Amino acid sequence: VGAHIALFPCAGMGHLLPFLRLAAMLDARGCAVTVITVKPTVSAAESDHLSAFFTIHPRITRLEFQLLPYQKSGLRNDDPFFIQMETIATSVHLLRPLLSSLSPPLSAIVSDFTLTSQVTDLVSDLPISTYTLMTSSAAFFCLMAYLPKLLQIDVANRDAIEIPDLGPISMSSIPPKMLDPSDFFSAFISSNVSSLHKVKGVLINTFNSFESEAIEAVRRNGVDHILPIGPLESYDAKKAHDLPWLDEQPPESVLFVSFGSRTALSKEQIRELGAALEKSGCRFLWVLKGGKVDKEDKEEEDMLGASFVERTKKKGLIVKGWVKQEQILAHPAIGGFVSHCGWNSVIEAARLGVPVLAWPQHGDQSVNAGVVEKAGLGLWVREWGWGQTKLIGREEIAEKMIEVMQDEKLRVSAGEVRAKAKETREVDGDSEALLQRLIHSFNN
Amino acid sequence: AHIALFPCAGMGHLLPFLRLAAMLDARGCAVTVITVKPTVSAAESDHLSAFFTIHPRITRLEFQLLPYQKSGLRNDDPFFIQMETIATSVHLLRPLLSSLSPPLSAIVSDFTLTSQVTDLVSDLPISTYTLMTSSAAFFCLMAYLPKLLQIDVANRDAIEIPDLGPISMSSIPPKMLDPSDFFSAFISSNVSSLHKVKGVLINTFNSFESEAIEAVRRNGVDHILPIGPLESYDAKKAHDLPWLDEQPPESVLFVSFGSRTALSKEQIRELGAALEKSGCRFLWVLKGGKVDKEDKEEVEDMLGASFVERTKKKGLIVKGWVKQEQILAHPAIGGFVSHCGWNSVIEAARLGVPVLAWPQHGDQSVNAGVVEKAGLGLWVREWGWGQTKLIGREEIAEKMIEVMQDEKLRVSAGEVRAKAKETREVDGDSEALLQRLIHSFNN
Amino acid sequence: NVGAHIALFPCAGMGHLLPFLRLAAMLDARGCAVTVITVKPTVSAAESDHLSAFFTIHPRITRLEFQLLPYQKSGLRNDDPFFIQMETIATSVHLLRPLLSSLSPPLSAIVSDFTLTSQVTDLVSDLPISTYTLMTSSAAFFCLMAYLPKLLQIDVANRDAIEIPDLGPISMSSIPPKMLDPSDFFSAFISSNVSSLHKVKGVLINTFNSFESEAIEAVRRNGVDHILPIGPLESYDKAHDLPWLDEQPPESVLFVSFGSRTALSKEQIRELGAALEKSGCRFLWVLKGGKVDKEDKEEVEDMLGASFVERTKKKGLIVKGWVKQEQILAHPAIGGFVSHCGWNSVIEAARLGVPVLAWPQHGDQSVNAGVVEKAGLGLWVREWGWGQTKLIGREEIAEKMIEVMQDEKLRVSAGEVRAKAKETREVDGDSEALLQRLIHSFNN
Amino acid sequence: VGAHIALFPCAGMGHLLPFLRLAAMLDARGCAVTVITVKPTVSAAESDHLSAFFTIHPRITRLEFQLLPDDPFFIQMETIATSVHLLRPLLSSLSPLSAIVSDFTLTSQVTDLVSDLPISTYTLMTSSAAFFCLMAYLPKLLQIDVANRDAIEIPDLGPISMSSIPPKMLDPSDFFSAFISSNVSSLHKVKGVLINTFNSFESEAIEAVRRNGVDHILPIGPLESYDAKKAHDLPWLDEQPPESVLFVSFGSRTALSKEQIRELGAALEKSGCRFLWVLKGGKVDKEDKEEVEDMLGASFVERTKKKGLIVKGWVKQEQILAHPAIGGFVSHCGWNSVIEAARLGVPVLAWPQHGDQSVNAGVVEKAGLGLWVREWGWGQTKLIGREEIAEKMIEVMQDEKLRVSAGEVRAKAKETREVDGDSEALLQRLIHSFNN
Numbered sequence A: 001v002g003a004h005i006a007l008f009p010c011a012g013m014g015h016l017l018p019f020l021r022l023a024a025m026l027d028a029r030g031c032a033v034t035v036i037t038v039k040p041t042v043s044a045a046e047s048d049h050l051s052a053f054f055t056i057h058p059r060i061t062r063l064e065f066q067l068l069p070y071q072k073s074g075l076r077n078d079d080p081f082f083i084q085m086e087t088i089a090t091s092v093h094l095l096r097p098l099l100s101s102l103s104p105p106l107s108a109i110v111s112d113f114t115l116t117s118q119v120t121d122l123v124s125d126l127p128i129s130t131y132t133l134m135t136s137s138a139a140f141f142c143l144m145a146y147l148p149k150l151l152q153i154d155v156a157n158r159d160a161i162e163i164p165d166l167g168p169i170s171m172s173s174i175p176p177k178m179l180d181p182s183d184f185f186s187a188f189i190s191s192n193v194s195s196l197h198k199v200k201g202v203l204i205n206t207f208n209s210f211e212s213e214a215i216e217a218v219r220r221n222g223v224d225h226i227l228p229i230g231p232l233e234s235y236d237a238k239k240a241h242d243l244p245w246l247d248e249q250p251p252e253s254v255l256f257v258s259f260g261s262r263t264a265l266s267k268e269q270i271r272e273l274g275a276a277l278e279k280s281g282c283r284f285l286w287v288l289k290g291g292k293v294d295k296e297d298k299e300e301e302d303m304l305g306a307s308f309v310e311r312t313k314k315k316g317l318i319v320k321g322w323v324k325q326e327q328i329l330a331h332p333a334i335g336g337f338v339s340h341c342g343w344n345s346v347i348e349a350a351r352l353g354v355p356v357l358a359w360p361q362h363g364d365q366s367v368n369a370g371v372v373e374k375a376g377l378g379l380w381v382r383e384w385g386w387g388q389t390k391l392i393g394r395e396e397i398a399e400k401m402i403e404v405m406q407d408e409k410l411r412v413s414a415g416e417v418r419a420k421a422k423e424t425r426e427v428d429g430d431s432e433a434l435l436q437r438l439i440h441s442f443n444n
Numbered sequence B: 001a002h003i004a005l006f007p008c009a010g011m012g013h014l015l016p017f018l019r020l021a022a023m024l025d026a027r028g029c030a031v032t033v034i035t036v037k038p039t040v041s042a043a044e045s046d047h048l049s050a051f052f053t054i055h056p057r058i059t060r061l062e063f064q065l066l067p068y069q070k071s072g073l074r075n076d077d078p079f080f081i082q083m084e085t086i087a088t089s090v091h092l093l094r095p096l097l098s099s100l101s102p103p104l105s106a107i108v109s110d111f112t113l114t115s116q117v118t119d120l121v122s123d124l125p126i127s128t129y130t131l132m133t134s135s136a137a138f139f140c141l142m143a144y145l146p147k148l149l150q151i152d153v154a155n156r157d158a159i160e161i162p163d164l165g166p167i168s169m170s171s172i173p174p175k176m177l178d179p180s181d182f183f184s185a186f187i188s189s190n191v192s193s194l195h196k197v198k199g200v201l202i203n204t205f206n207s208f209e210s211e212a213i214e215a216v217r218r219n220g221v222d223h224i225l226p227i228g229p230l231e232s233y234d235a236k237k238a239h240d241l242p243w244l245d246e247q248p249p250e251s252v253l254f255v256s257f258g259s260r261t262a263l264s265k266e267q268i269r270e271l272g273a274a275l276e277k278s279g280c281r282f283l284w285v286l287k288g289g290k291v292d293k294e295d296k297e298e299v300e301d302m303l304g305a306s307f308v309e310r311t312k313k314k315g316l317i318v319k320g321w322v323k324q325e326q327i328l329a330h331p332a333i334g335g336f337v338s339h340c341g342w343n344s345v346i347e348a349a350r351l352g353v354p355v356l357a358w359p360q361h362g363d364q365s366v367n368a369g370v371v372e373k374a375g376l377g378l379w380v381r382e383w384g385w386g387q388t389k390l391i392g393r394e395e396i397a398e399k400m401i402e403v404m405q406d407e408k409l410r411v412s413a414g415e416v417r418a419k420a421k422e423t424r425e426v427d428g429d430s431e432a433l434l435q436r437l438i439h440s441f442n443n
Numbered sequence C: 001n002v003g004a005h006i007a008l009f010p011c012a013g014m015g016h017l018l019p020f021l022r023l024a025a026m027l028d029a030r031g032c033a034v035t036v037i038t039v040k041p042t043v044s045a046a047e048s049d050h051l052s053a054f055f056t057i058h059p060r061i062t063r064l065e066f067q068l069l070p071y072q073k074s075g076l077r078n079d080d081p082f083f084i085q086m087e088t089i090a091t092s093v094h095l096l097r098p099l100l101s102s103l104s105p106p107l108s109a110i111v112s113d114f115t116l117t118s119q120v121t122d123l124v125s126d127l128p129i130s131t132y133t134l135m136t137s138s139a140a141f142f143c144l145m146a147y148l149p150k151l152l153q154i155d156v157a158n159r160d161a162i163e164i165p166d167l168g169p170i171s172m173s174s175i176p177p178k179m180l181d182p183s184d185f186f187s188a189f190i191s192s193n194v195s196s197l198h199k200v201k202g203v204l205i206n207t208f209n210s211f212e213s214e215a216i217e218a219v220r221r222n223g224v225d226h227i228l229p230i231g232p233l234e235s236y237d238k239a240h241d242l243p244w245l246d247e248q249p250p251e252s253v254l255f256v257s258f259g260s261r262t263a264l265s266k267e268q269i270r271e272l273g274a275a276l277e278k279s280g281c282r283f284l285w286v287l288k289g290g291k292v293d294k295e296d297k298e299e300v301e302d303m304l305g306a307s308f309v310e311r312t313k314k315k316g317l318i319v320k321g322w323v324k325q326e327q328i329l330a331h332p333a334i335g336g337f338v339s340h341c342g343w344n345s346v347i348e349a350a351r352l353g354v355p356v357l358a359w360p361q362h363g364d365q366s367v368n369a370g371v372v373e374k375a376g377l378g379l380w381v382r383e384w385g386w387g388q389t390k391l392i393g394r395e396e397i398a399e400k401m402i403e404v405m406q407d408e409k410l411r412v413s414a415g416e417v418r419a420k421a422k423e424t425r426e427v428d429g430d431s432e433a434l435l436q437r438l439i440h441s442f443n444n
Numbered sequence D: 001v002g003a004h005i006a007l008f009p010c011a012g013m014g015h016l017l018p019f020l021r022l023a024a025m026l027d028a029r030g031c032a033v034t035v036i037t038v039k040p041t042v043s044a045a046e047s048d049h050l051s052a053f054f055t056i057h058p059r060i061t062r063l064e065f066q067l068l069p070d071d072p073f074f075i076q077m078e079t080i081a082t083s084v085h086l087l088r089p090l091l092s093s094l095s096p097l098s099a100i101v102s103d104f105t106l107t108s109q110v111t112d113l114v115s116d117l118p119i120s121t122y123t124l125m126t127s128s129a130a131f132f133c134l135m136a137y138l139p140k141l142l143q144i145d146v147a148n149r150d151a152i153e154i155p156d157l158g159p160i161s162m163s164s165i166p167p168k169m170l171d172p173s174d175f176f177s178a179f180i181s182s183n184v185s186s187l188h189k190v191k192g193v194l195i196n197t198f199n200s201f202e203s204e205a206i207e208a209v210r211r212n213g214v215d216h217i218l219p220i221g222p223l224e225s226y227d228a229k230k231a232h233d234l235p236w237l238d239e240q241p242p243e244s245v246l247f248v249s250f251g252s253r254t255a256l257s258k259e260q261i262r263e264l265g266a267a268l269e270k271s272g273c274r275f276l277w278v279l280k281g282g283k284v285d286k287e288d289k290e291e292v293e294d295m296l297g298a299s300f301v302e303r304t305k306k307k308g309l310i311v312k313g314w315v316k317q318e319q320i321l322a323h324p325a326i327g328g329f330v331s332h333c334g335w336n337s338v339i340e341a342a343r344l345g346v347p348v349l350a351w352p353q354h355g356d357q358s359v360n361a362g363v364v365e366k367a368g369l370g371l372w373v374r375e376w377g378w379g380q381t382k383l384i385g386r387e388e389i390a391e392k393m394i395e396v397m398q399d400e401k402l403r404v405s406a407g408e409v410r411a412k413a414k415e416t417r418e419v420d421g422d423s424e425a426l427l428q429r430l431i432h433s434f435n436n
């Protein structure tokens, strides 16, 4: 553990967990690692996860930063993660005192994409080689990467968007917010992509077989230094879960439902899947988030209904809250996965080879579904659209759930992805060799 | 894009730059604000500290200016004297600006520092912009000063500025016409170097000064950009609000004469006599000591105990810094008395307060004219120059009464208030221009 | 109430605290009433440790302590932990204003660190309090500091050397690059503070008139007229120290220390250790190897290895951590000092007439090394340059290490320095007399 | 107390002490007074006096000008001129001056200053009416004659001999001439002029200045003491009988050589006068002076230890002179001192070392205030014998007429000091003129 490295996730479970994963991974490869967190955390969950991680890994060290107050309405409405990410920039300078005192000077720092522009000054005064880890799809990341020239190019939204060395992305996959220049979200991505130039390398949670077209497209696309790190290894946070029912079930019989760290859909729609879930007869494990964005704000299982919970009393079990998704997904009993297609959830399923039913709700998740379908890892119906854009059928959903359980071709293809994913983590694997090579390059 | 703001001395110069800087930061530019020490007035120093603690990501660049060194520019004013001191030392900042870790894309300089600042970034890759504290109408007079000085052989009536109504000779300040005085030398020296500036920022909206903004555009300053009204950085802890809450809406008349303007000893007693005689409710900010806040160490021994007792029911007299923008927003204030320094004037317009115009020194008279033109307030030209003139209680009181009860003004003033709102809106020109400007900054 | 009250305000670091603590103790002896202003938390354990300990030793002196506020963006390029705190304290100096006004026994005067003189000066003015500056470094370096605004502003020239106005030219090669770069904190702090000196009633320098007559004049003639050499500051004062020395012959031991704040290159350390072995001189070696902070330098002998220690056990002993430097130099056994030539250590060596071999690492230190050579205190090799950026071979070091121990004229010269130092301390001596003179004005 | 005023003396206690008294006098008359001072001050005493003055008068504000980089006192007067602009910020921030009273030496520099910040300005002269005219008539005189004659005449003033006149003032080349001549020209700007004199002391002198175009001269003499109270010093003063003690002070600077000074020291014991002697070591500098009383010799101290006391350094002159014990004064004859003697009615012996003083001695003679020997001349020029001095010294103690003449002079001084008298009347009037 001669080399000293830090990783600095900003906000959100999707951002936070992987970086921890990168750190544990880095520690495993003889790196000395500090993990930087900024408080107060947006969600109760983020700290809960963080606390365990440090307890679980003593060798890795916690490096908190306390946030200063801010009040800017320029950011549209009130979504806390952009606000949290924005606040982090306001207090980012507070970082400098913290880095100056590090015992063995940091060889490199790994920084979440959202604040790559603020850190840059910090990265010139203290000359730290700075790296980034991408939580999104390489195909989706390819879109952001080419966004600035594409945003400069036109004023209206066309039928299909062409990123230069990649298959054109349908506009339906793209978020509205991305398209309009005036909107801030556009501002945050554009500036940050520019800051990539300063960075020594860019790391993404995907592997070359997995996104062959995109990774190369990125290569000639102005993102030369991108390294396919993924799939990010398990956090090894053992353990906090009781699953007597899961053990009883036959291997690959049970269906797992998670819509991500945040809730994805309306109750009326939600009841529709529950009704369709009954029609399918799949044994299930369902994790439900009452609060669409914050764990702290949810004190609501009223939404599914009284009759349904008793009706599926022996068919399935549901958790209202947080459960270990990878711990559950590695179980022999789980054979199908219905996800919101956040890239971390999609990547974990590919690593464990669990067939996916893609049900993207917002953001980059629609683009990840296209990768899920292109990979052959999962089944996706593009026509479902964004959440609340259309109300998709109980009867319609049931046919798709029945296909995932009884389509053997998906199982053979899903099995291949697990083998493809495993091979890249083997000593001869490009992903393991790239991580090992990057660690070798870090200076004393 | 890194932008640096270089305000000169004075809360009139200081307040606008910080306000914009906060606006720039809100809209996402990396912002640095340049301050130098010492500062003439306590408020500027106290304010800067407050502003930075409220806005953490804005960098503070502090330089100690060289000791006052001079020859020429007859100056009897402390704030103007400090401006000369900042201007003579701006050329020593070239070494510091060259090595800044996040290099500046552009500098937004103060009008007074524009000539020295333009020379400073000549061989550096930094765009030079200037923010104008005053009104657009005054800028037309500034542009015409060389023509005004050359063909000004006769002391008669007013001079017709080329694209708008002629200004009375009484409105032009006598100091502006004397080349020896600092006010004239600085105005002339800066206008000559305005052509080396990428853009000139102004605190007026297109609705407020359509003729003045248009006249300057065709008069050689073709890069003018209206961004007004500037928005408050809304940072404040001390509350002096309580008396007002007791007051009925619109009853109170607010009197203030800016950061560094004081009345005559005969005028303070005649103004006080008028406030009693009028019978109006009022809020008085008393700045008897003079410009500097530190030396104005007196504490209401200007009027005496007898007067406070008589007026306590209808008035509160405060000596010290008051949160002007907040007071103006209050339901209670239905009148304002102003020296018509532009920043007060803009605030009156944004918050729709009827204004009673009372110039004491410099641009105030022209701005007073603008205020009258737009219906914002009533101006009495005959009163002429405060500090050169004395007005009796009878005259003052009647005007005070008249402004409070002009419903046409209250209706008229509101209309300006609406227009100021529109411009800030995304459609509205002033915000749009800044949004237009901000993109430009990215290079 | 009818008694002078003097407050001392030190900055970050052992070098800046200790001179202040020592003076505070010196003043207390001479009947002054002393208060020390301290900010928590300390950058390093040692400063914390001394303060609690120091106040135990001198109960009468008041300890006035303040909280360290968050770091601010004032545009400096500092990557150092001790400099950054210096920055952090200064931003918050204005906050003290209400408190100084309200003290039970009021302040009559205060003395500021150079770093806080510009900020400190402003607070006093609304109070009837005299202001003084106590300066950590040498007169000769001080000569440079005053020049700095003039030097930065115009010449902008990379000549071989430049000349300070009433003092001989100083080689550029012996001037740190960072002093030259305006954006950097080191240049910026020196310049802003120097400019504010006109305000201070006097500037106190820990050097004596015999030691730097030429510099003292050079500064005086340059118009910061009020200069008050007080050197050398007296130990304020048993402990769990080393008895290894008590068993060593006199003059047989060579002491190596680079101060509290200097780490060394691992290459540098390996070569330096090897050099001692060839030289064969008995030695005491202190490793501030690790970080500037004692808290984060957890490295033990993992830096030198096991074999080096056993081989050298007869020859010398190496310790990592705080050592009681004053006591060690005082010991009859120590025959030579290898020092980075920081002023506090340089002055101490002069006090005890210990021959110095000069190896300046950063900042003020090269200018300091030269005077050390000049006064006949020590041997300095110019070609070695800066410790931080250049590495010196073991053999060259060993050959030099021998020379200082073997040269006996230097031992005679160092003694000459010592006698002079003794002369000032005495009631006859100008420095003691100057301090007594200073006290009487304090007592108005 | 409405009016607000400021004083500015550049250097010497010759000017500062009078100015401060002017400052105190003005405060008494209901004026807000600000005193402007130059730093660093040339003398530790000059600095010493200022701190005391503000401390003694709480309500008098102090404003200072820090200074940017022959006689120290003259050169510094030159330096203040360099930094005069520094004044500009100070005036601008003032809580504005109804008028400023400024030192004669730097009046020329300020003329520009007065005109931009409109301030009526005045100057106060610390030299005699007879001497001021010599300065006053000097500019014409230099160009017109360019020669050396035994005596020189100022239009309505009885000619005083060259022997009195200082040599340097005579030379056109010299720095001193430029300052004096230039400044008088600047004298035109001021709305008043003040000298520490009263008409009675020099009716002839005051008139000539009125005649000679110094129409605006105002004599406000004598200036009231600004003083500390109360210190139990000089138990050696209270002990002695009235008018038994001779007090010797050659200046606010040294004036004669150790051997020349030894002759008076030997003359003092032969004279038999009891004495309090103020002996300054530094020829011109208090900080420079670091010599003990070894110029007089150990022997002198043992012999006279009961008879008289020697103070090395400074003392409060007005305080000492006012004492019953003092009956004789020996003076270098600096005007400020001479005026103090007349107001306190203490007989003087005149021994002027340098400069304006010899002319000042002449005034004392016309007055009858003291006994003077002209032949003794410029200090250190010639050696004056111990035997010769005593006869004059004894004569000062035992002359009845002198006591009478001196008694009147004190009486005359008061009448102007009182409300009816002109010096008081003008002060009242000038303040009245002062406009808020």
Ligand SMILES: O=c1ccn([C@@H]2O[C@H](COP(=O)(O)OP(=O)(O)O)[C@@H](O)[C@H]2O)c(=O)[nH]1
Residues within 6 Å of the ligand: A012, A013, A014, A015, A017, A258, A259, A260, A261, A262, A287, A321, A322, A323, A324, A325, A326, A341, A342, A343, A344, A345, A346, A348
């Ligand atoms: O109950 C839950 C919900 C989510 N996750 C983890 O949350 C991470 C982030 O999910 P993703 O990136 O797919 O989407 P997000 O929640 O950020 O929208 C993934 O590692 C999931 O395994 C989990 O472990 N348990």
Ligand SMILES: O=c1ccn([C@@H]2O[C@H](COP(=O)(O)OP(=O)(O)O)[C@@H](O)[C@H]2O)c(=O)[nH]1
Residues within 6 Å of the ligand: B010, B011, B012, B013, B015, B256, B257, B258, B259, B260, B261, B285, B320, B321, B322, B323, B324, B325, B339, B340, B341, B342, B343, B344, B345, B347
């Ligand atoms: O007691 C005061 C006086 C002034 N101001 C602020 O100072 C600003 C600038 O004043 P202006 O430019 O109107 O006049 P000036 O001070 O420049 O002569 C105004 O917006 C006021 O809000 C204030 O807050 N409190």
Ligand SMILES: O=c1ccn([C@@H]2O[C@H](COP(=O)(O)OP(=O)(O)O)[C@@H](O)[C@H]2O)c(=O)[nH]1
Residues within 6 Å of the ligand: C013, C014, C015, C016, C018, C257, C258, C259, C260, C261, C262, C286, C321, C322, C323, C324, C325, C326, C341, C342, C343, C344, C345, C346, C348
């Ligand atoms: O192990 C150590 C190291 C340093 N010092 C003392 O710390 C003071 C400050 O050191 P200096 O200024 O010489 O160097 P710096 O620590 O600032 O680099 C000196 O008195 C040293 O004797 C000490 O007592 N023990």
Ligand SMILES: O=c1ccn([C@@H]2O[C@H](COP(=O)(O)OP(=O)(O)O)[C@@H](O)[C@H]2O)c(=O)[nH]1
Residues within 6 Å of the ligand: D012, D013, D014, D015, D017, D018, D126, D249, D250, D251, D252, D253, D278, D313, D314, D315, D316, D317, D318, D333, D334, D335, D336, D337, D338, D340
């Ligand atoms: O020991 C001394 C000597 C002088 N003076 C004062 O010196 C002032 C001015 O002295 P003068 O101008 O007459 O003499 P000079 O300064 O020219 O030598 C008078 O007010 C004296 O009271 C004093 O107070 N103490």
